[PDB]
Design a protein around this ligand. Structure first.
Ligand SMILES: [Zn+2]
Length: 65
RNA sequence: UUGAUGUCACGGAACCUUUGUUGUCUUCGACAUGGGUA
């Protein structure tokens, strides 16, 4: 879970409005800590939650190839 | 030409069955051609 001096929480992969999602994850998620995910109203998010884009508005946007 | 907090599709052998095989003496004789003369 270390990345530089920071440590990543488990991320969040849990959506209440399931029917929005065309696909749902069937595989298990890899684990590295017992700690809970970052709060949904936090200001500061760990690097994994930045990569997830959880921090019309994107933080990391992938274009098509 | 995607939409985003969730994609094991490297998650799936074009695989399985089917005889290029059955039948046949390297033999042997009468035939071609269209008129001619009253
Ligand atoms: Zn986090």
């Amino acid at each position: 879970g270390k990345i530089s001096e920071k440590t990543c929480c488990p991320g969040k992969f849990d959506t209440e409005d399931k029917d929005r999602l065309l696909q749902l994850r069937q595989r298990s998620t890899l684990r590295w800590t017992d700690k809970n995910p970052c709060p949904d109203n936090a200001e500061t998010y760990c690097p994994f939650c930045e990569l997830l884009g959880r921090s019309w508005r994107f933080r990391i946007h992938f274009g098509n190839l």
